[PDB]
Amino acid sequence: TVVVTTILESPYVMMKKNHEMLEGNERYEGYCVDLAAEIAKHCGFKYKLTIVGDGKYGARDADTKIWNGMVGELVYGKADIAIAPLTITLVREEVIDFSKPFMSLGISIMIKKGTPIESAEDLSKQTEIAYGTLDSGSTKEFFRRSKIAVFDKMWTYMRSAEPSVFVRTTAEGVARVRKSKGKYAYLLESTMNEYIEQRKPCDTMKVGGNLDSKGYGIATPKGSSLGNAVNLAVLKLNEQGLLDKLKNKWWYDKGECG
Numbered sequence: 010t011v012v013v014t015t016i017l018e019s020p021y022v023m024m025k026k027n028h029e030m031l032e033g034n035e036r037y038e039g040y041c042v043d044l045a046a047e048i049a050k051h052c053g054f055k056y057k058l059t060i061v062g063d064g065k066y067g068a069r070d071a072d073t074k075i076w077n078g079m080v081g082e083l084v085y086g087k088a089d090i091a092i093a094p095l096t097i098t099l100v101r102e103e104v105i106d107f108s109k110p111f112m113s114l115g116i117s118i119m120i121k122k123g124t125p126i127e128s129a130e131d132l133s134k135q136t137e138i139a140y141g142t143l144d145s146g147s148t149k150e151f152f153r154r155s156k157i158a159v160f161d162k163m164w165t166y167m168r169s170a171e172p173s174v175f176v177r178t179t180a181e182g183v184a185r186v187r188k189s190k191g192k193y194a195y196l197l198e199s200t201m202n203e204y205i206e207q208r209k210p211c212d213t214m215k216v217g218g219n220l221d222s223k224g225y226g227i228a229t230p231k232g233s234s235l236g237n238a239v240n241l242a243v244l245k246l247n248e249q250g251l252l253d254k255l256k257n258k259w260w261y262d263k264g265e266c267g
């Protein structure tokens with residue numbers, strides 16, 4: 010029985026309305042719940058969905074060099090596979106294996122609609138509008154490592170800003186954009202940015218294009234007997250249009266903007 014780690018982010022994984030009446034994997038619904046079921050059915054294994062204990066995607070602690078988040082759950086044996094919007098990055102590939110991507114994304118900028126910011130460079134050259142990103146995720150790592158002048162300027166500001174411009178959850182980032190009256194911009198992936206832009210109260214927007222181009226992948230620990238079969242499953246699901254089907258199922262709700 011394969012232990013799956015994932016993260017409670019709508020629309021990937023959500024508690025069903027009647028979850029108290031249900032058990033095990035039946036408590037959950039969403040894109041990654043369906044994807045887990047499809048991967049398991051194609052590979053022929055039983056599995057148990059679990060929510061990442063520390064709530065994080067995953068970064069290497071600068072002091073202890075210990076990985077946290079879903080990455081750490083794989084590296085140190087709490088889970089066998091991660092099925093989540095987990096970004097494929099070279100630093101993470103040092104310690105875990107990824108499938109080919111099942112969804113594309115890029116780093117992007119979220120603002121309150123009407124805020125006078127058109128680009129990363131616009132953000133970088135001012136301080137009235139604070140801006141930041143998620144702790145222990147791939148976007149913070151991207152900015153920390155970037156040698157692009159604009160992005161390094163942004164990092165130099167973010168890493169030393171007080172009070173902190175970083176958030177612990179993606180929902181907190183979005184809430185801070187909304188609560189700040191245009192005085193906070195959140196650096197987050199284009200998936201969440203566009204998903205939120207389409208939903209009530211319809212007060213946020215993605216500005217400029219994306220800052221990079223990456224993907225989400227299914228992750229396994231190095232040496233896992235599962236890696237090969239999981240990668241083949243993702244490729245077949247993609248080819249068969251199942252990933253398109255899951256996006257069409259989970260991305261668009263009734264009663265949203267427009």
Ligand SMILES: Cc1cccc(Cn2nnc(-c3o[nH]c(=O)c3C[C@H](N)C(=O)O)n2)c1
Nearest residue numbers: 066094095096146147148197198200201204
């Ligand atoms: C549609 C939808 C709804 C909610 C959440 C998501 C996934 N997601 N969107 N943005 C992020 C994100 O932004 N900066 C980061 O660091 C991460 C995390 C990143 N994916 C990582 O692996 O570290 N993660 C997508």
